[PDB]
Amino acid sequence: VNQNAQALNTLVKQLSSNFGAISSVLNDILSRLDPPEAEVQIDRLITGRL
Amino acid sequence: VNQNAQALNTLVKQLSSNFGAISSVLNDILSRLDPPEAEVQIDRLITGRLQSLQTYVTQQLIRAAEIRASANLAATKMSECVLGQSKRVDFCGKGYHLM
Amino acid sequence: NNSYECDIPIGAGICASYQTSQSIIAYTMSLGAENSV
Amino acid sequence: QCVNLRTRTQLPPAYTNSFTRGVYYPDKVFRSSVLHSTQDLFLPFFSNVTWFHAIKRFDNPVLPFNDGVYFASTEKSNIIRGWIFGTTLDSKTQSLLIVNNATNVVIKVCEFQFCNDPFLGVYYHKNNKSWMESGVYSSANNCTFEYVSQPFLMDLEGKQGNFKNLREFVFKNIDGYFKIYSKHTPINLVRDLPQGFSALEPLVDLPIGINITRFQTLLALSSSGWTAGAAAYYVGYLQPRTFLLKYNENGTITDAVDCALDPLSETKCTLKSFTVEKG
Amino acid sequence: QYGSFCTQLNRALTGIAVEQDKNTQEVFAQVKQIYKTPPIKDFGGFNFSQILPDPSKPSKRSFIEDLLFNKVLICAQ
Amino acid sequence: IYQTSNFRVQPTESIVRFPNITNLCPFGEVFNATRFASVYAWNRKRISNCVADYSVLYNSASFSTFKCYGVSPTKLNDLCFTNVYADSFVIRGDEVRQIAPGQTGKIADYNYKLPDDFTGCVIAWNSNNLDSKVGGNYNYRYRLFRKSNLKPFERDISTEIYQAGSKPCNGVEGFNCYFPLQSYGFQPTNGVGYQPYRVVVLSFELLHAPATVCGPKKSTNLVKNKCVNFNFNGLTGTGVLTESNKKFLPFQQFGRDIADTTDAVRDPQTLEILDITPCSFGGVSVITPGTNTSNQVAVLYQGVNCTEVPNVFQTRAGCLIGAEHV
Numbered sequence: 001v002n003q004n005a006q007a008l009n010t011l012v013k014q015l016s017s018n019f020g021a022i023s024s025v026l027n028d029i030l031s032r033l034d035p036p037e038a039e040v041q042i043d044r045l046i047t048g049r050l
Numbered sequence: 051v052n053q054n055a056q057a058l059n060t061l062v063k064q065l066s067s068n069f070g071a072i073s074s075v076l077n078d079i080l081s082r083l084d085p086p087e088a089e090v091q092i093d094r095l096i097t098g099r100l101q102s103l104q105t106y107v108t109q110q111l112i113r114a115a116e117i118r119a120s121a122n123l124a125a126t127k128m129s130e131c132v133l134g135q136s137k138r139v140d141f142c143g144k145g146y147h148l149m
Numbered sequence: 150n151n152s153y154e155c156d157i158p159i160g161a162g163i164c165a166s167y168q169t170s171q172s173i174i175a176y177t178m179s180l181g182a183e184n185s186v
Numbered sequence: 187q188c189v190n191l192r193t194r195t196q197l198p199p200a201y202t203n204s205f206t207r208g209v210y211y212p213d214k215v216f217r218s219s220v221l222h223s224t225q226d227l228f229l230p231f232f233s234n235v236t237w238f239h240a241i242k243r244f245d246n247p248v249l250p251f252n253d254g255v256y257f258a259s260t261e262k263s264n265i266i267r268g269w270i271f272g273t274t275l276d277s278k279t280q281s282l283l284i285v286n287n288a289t290n291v292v293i294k295v296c297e298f299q300f301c302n303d304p305f306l307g308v309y310y311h312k313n314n315k316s317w318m319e320s321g322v323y324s325s326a327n328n329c330t331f332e333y334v335s336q337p338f339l340m341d342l343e344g345k346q347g348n349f350k351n352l353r354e355f356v357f358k359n360i361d362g363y364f365k366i367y368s369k370h371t372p373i374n375l376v377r378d379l380p381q382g383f384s385a386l387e388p389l390v391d392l393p394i395g396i397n398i399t400r401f402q403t404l405l406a407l408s409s410s411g412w413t414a415g416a417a418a419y420y421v422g423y424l425q426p427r428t429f430l431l432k433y434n435e436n437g438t439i440t441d442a443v444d445c446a447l448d449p450l451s452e453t454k455c456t457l458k459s460f461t462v463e464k465g
Numbered sequence: 466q467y468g469s470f471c472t473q474l475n476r477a478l479t480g481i482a483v484e485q486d487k488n489t490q491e492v493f494a495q496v497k498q499i500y501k502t503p504p505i506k507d508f509g510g511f512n513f514s515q516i517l518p519d520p521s522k523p524s525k526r527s528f529i530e531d532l533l534f535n536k537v538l539i540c541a542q
Numbered sequence: 543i544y545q546t547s548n549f550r551v552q553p554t555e556s557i558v559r560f561p562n563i564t565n566l567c568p569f570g571e572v573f574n575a576t577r578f579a580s581v582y583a584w585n586r587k588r589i590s591n592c593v594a595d596y597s598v599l600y601n602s603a604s605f606s607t608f609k610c611y612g613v614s615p616t617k618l619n620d621l622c623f624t625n626v627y628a629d630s631f632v633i634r635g636d637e638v639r640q641i642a643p644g645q646t647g648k649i650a651d652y653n654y655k656l657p658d659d660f661t662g663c664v665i666a667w668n669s670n671n672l673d674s675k676v677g678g679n680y681n682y683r684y685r686l687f688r689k690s691n692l693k694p695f696e697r698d699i700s701t702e703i704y705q706a707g708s709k710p711c712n713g714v715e716g717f718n719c720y721f722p723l724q725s726y727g728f729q730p731t732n733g734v735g736y737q738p739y740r741v742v743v744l745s746f747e748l749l750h751a752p753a754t755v756c757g758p759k760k761s762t763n764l765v766k767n768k769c770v771n772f773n774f775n776g777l778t779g780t781g782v783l784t785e786s787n788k789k790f791l792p793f794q795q796f797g798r799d800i801a802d803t804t805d806a807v808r809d810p811q812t813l814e815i816l817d818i819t820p821c822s823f824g825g826v827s828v829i830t831p832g833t834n835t836s837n838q839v840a841v842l843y844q845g846v847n848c849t850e851v852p853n854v855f856q857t858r859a860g861c862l863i864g865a866e867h868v
């Protein structure tokens with residue numbers, strides 16, 4: 001059990017890393033920058049989470 | 051033993067590839083470019099080395115999980131052939147087992 | 150046309166070896182010896 | 187300022203198998219007791235060569251230049267004394283002139299005016315052990331680079347039974363640079379190209395950056411009438427290929443193996459080993 | 466900036482090492498204590514002077530064990 | 543037992559040994575040249591066997607535009623160069639943005655190109671005061687047309703008449719034929735961008751040969767058996783320098799010798815085959831009983847002699863401190 005419980009936590013914290021981007025919230029970056037220079041930031045988060 | 055040596059040798063040969071960067075030495079690129087645009091080159095090396103290290107770890111995981119089965123089989127054979135006589139055909143030798 | 154135990158497997162039941170001058174010869178595999186009961 | 191020569195032994199070119207010649211150190215860096223595979227310009231194993239003689243028999247043709255050249259020369263008293271490199275050889279393009287002067291090798295980068303049959307004129311019509319050389323060269327108005335070499339001296343006379351003089355030079359003109367690699371070693375065989383393996387240490391590199399597509403050799407040469415011993419030289423053409431070199435613990439190239447010659451060589455290049463198990 | 470990967474890698478490698486140690490411990494240590502053969506051996510005419518331990522050795526290996534050990538950079542990595 | 547906070551030994555001092563200084567590189571006469579030739583007849587110069595200080599040039603405001611691509615100019619004085627390739631010419635200002643590699647243009651493709659991996663630095667400076675002619679500096683010519691765009695760093699000087707069609711060109715001028723050269727219009731009345739501009743470019747290679755062009759050296763000594771920072775000829779590293787029995791040829795430097803690392807290497811100013819060895823490192827571990835029971839712990843240094851680290855008992859796996867052997 002514990003070992004399995006050691007995995008999920010290490011996944012959830014991954015949702016709080018810059019991954020080379022400027023932030024860690026999709027809503028914030030979406031509402032702080034226009035799209036055409038926002039795909040170039042969202043792609044890094046997509047790659048890291050994949 | 052040969053497989054274990056080959057894995058490490060292939061892992062260590064990876065430290066001499068451009069990976070799309072302009073060189074293969076961190077000290078050289080650090081001492082040849084200003085830090086405003088050094089990350090744009092260092093990140094490629096970081097990504098490549100992460101990929102290689104993850105592949106090596108996965109291979110080691112699979113091979114160790116395989117060898118666990120051989121360890122268990124050896125344990126069973128030692129507990130059956132040695133400390134007694136086993137009637138399973140073609141387990142403890144080819145024929146009629148004695149000891 | 151003969152039959153021998155396989156040394157270097159090629160595939161589809163055909164495999165080769167080195168034998169007598171000396172050359173590499175390929176042939177159909179032999180399923181061991183044969184006998185009746 | 188020259189006299190044309192046509193007293194030559196007109197024969198079709200001869201051919202010989204270049205067994206294991208044309209391997210040299212690739213880079214300036216040093217390794218030891220390792221195996222290294224690299225691709226570059228080299229002379230493939232078991233290849234034909236162009237054979238010329240020198241004694242009547244004064245073989246002085248003009249050969250095309252491309253992708254560098256490999257020059258081998260067996261002789262006594264080193265009758266060959268110079269090389270000329272260029273494109274048009276008419277004082278219309280930069281030309282390279284190498285002469286092993288009695289002191290050292292002299293290098294001349296000049297838009298020099300060659301004649302039809304230029305040679306290193308030696309006034310040795312009468313055999314009186316007189317090597318007086320008052321020979322003169324043509325116009326050399328346009329010059330760019332000049333170099334003087336180390337004064338290395340080699341034997342200029344002798345009639346030894348076994349051909350003690352044997353030179354192997356490799357000339358590579360790439361990326362605006364001219365690399366000359368040299369080796370000399372005695373041989374006790376009379377005519378056959380030596381069987382075995384020999385390394386090739388680099389000699390010199392010159393940044394020149396000119397265009398050359400043709401060359402000719404020069405030797406100690408009245409125009410008609412000479413008395414010199416037998417000598418032979420072979421010319422070979424290079425080719426871009428890939429070699430696997432086996433270094434040693436002492437830093438010397440022990441052996442080399444091709445990666446495109448034969449299937450067994452291909453397997454050796456794949457496995458990075460000198461021995462292959464059955465399979 | 467990449468977060469927590471090396472914790473995962475080190476945990477995996479440590480788990481592998483501990484598993485190997487456990488395997489080696491489990492395969493061999495099947496007996497609670499240690500026995501010893503008597504100095505005088507009369508096994509009904511049988512001969513065992515090739516697999517039993519030989520005292521005349523820096524280690525406690527046997528003849529066949531030594532033969533097996535014979536049949537099978539270091540610091541650059 | 544727990545494995546945390548891997549241990550390593552920090553360096554102490556630095557050695558900046560460099561070969562002997564020779565003289566000052568005469569780049570000033572290039573930068574203060576009397577006359578500059580045409581674009582197709584660019585001034586090509588090789589600078590070697592001297593010592594150059596580019597800090598003065600960088601701090602000098604005499605130039606106008608200055609783009610370094612392969613290297614950051616600020617630390618330009620901390621790198622040794624094998625050779626210096628200086629190419630100089632004069633171009634129209636409006637076309638100056640053809641200097642960079644990967645650009646598209648007339649001079650940028652027909653008669654002057656740069657390699658993709660170019661590492662040199664480009665300087666462009668207006669010289670309308672002295673290069674412009676009141677009657678027009680028409681001495682500068684260029685190739686308006688070229689049959690095939692030339693590879694980077696090759697000179698085309700042919701005077702062939704243009705051949706824009708399959709029909710043959712007869713005489714001095716034929717069908718679809720034009721003069722190979724066209725003069726540049728440079729006058730004092732020319733506006734901004736039409737004025738002449740002196741453009742120079744510097745190229746160099748890295749580590750392929752023992753370099754000869756450097757800057758300040760401050761060579762100190764050759765101390766041994768110390769974790770020091772070596773910067774002999776550009777390669778910056780940390781480790782200890784010892785004496786090795788390894789043999790070099792009279793022209794061998796920078797031995798790799800295993801996979802990719804700079805092994806035993808010679809030194810400048812002398813001829814000794816020194817050897818480089820990395821500093822000691824290891825993974826420390828902590829062994830503790832139940833923290834509910836007590837609080838004393840013990841520390842194990844793995845696979846490293848602890849005759850130096852800042853009731854010890856050195857073992858095979860390493861050495862253990864905080865506990866006593868029984």
Ligand SMILES: *[C@@H]1O[C@H](CO)[C@@H](O[C@@H]2O[C@H](CO)[C@@H](O)[C@H](O)[C@H]2NC(C)=O)[C@H](O)[C@H]1NC(C)=O
Pocket residue numbers: 511512513514
């Ligand atoms: C088991 O067999 C071995 C092999 O013959 C015996 O060892 C020999 O013993 C004799 C008499 O002591 C010696 O002369 C030989 O030199 C021994 N052979 C070797 C290879 O050392 C051994 O004694 C036998 N075990 C018994 C009889 O208990």
Ligand SMILES: *[C@@H]1O[C@H](CO)[C@@H](O)[C@H](O)[C@H]1NC(C)=O
Pocket residue numbers: 150
């Ligand atoms: C035996 O071998 C020969 C040689 O190829 C072949 O021609 C012949 O057909 C073979 N015979 C049989 C029965 O396979």
Ligand SMILES: *[C@@H]1O[C@H](CO)[C@@H](O)[C@H](O)[C@H]1NC(C)=O
Pocket residue numbers: 201232233234
């Ligand atoms: C060398 O030349 C001869 C005749 O010119 C020819 O017969 C021979 O095949 C050539 N060698 C090779 C390897 O082709």
Ligand SMILES: *[C@@H]1O[C@H](CO)[C@@H](O)[C@H](O)[C@H]1NC(C)=O
Pocket residue numbers: 287288289290
């Ligand atoms: C060339 O050799 C001659 C003959 O030994 C010698 O006098 C002369 O100094 C050498 N060098 C030059 C440049 O002529």
Ligand SMILES: *[C@@H]1O[C@H](CO)[C@@H](O)[C@H](O)[C@H]1NC(C)=O
Pocket residue numbers: 273397398399
């Ligand atoms: C070199 O000269 C030859 C003959 O003149 C010519 O065909 C070739 O294009 C030239 N190459 C270069 C790079 O100048």
Ligand SMILES: *[C@@H]1O[C@H](CO)[C@@H](O)[C@H](O)[C@H]1NC(C)=O
Pocket residue numbers: 436
């Ligand atoms: C390497 O060189 C040393 C000294 O020149 C010599 O003693 C040794 O024999 C050489 N190694 C081999 C394998 O010949």
Ligand SMILES: *[C@@H]1O[C@H](CO)[C@@H](O)[C@H](O)[C@H]1NC(C)=O
Pocket residue numbers: 570573574604
């Ligand atoms: C070269 O010119 C610059 C400015 O154009 C000047 O500062 C410098 O003193 C000049 N040097 C020489 C040697 O004329």
Ligand SMILES: *[C@@H]1O[C@H](CO)[C@@H](O)[C@H](O)[C@H]1NC(C)=O
Pocket residue numbers: 562811812
């Ligand atoms: C370097 O210069 C010093 C003193 O100026 C001298 O002692 C030494 O021999 C020189 N070494 C070289 C290689 O020039």
Ligand SMILES: *[C@@H]1O[C@H](CO)[C@@H](O)[C@H](O)[C@H]1NC(C)=O
Pocket residue numbers: 834835
């Ligand atoms: C610590 O150990 C003592 C000894 O049995 C026990 O009484 C106590 O409950 C333990 N405390 C904890 C927090 O485990």
Ligand SMILES: *[C@@H]1O[C@H](CO)[C@@H](O)[C@H](O)[C@H]1NC(C)=O
Pocket residue numbers: 847849856
């Ligand atoms: C390391 O420790 C061992 C055992 O005390 C000793 O033999 C050896 O000389 C030591 N080496 C160093 C470099 O301290």
Ligand SMILES: *[C@@H]1O[C@H](CO)[C@@H](O)[C@H](O)[C@H]1NC(C)=O
Pocket residue numbers: 867868
């Ligand atoms: C353990 O035994 C050895 C051998 O006599 C002795 O030297 C050592 O002092 C002993 N250790 C202790 C803690 O008494």
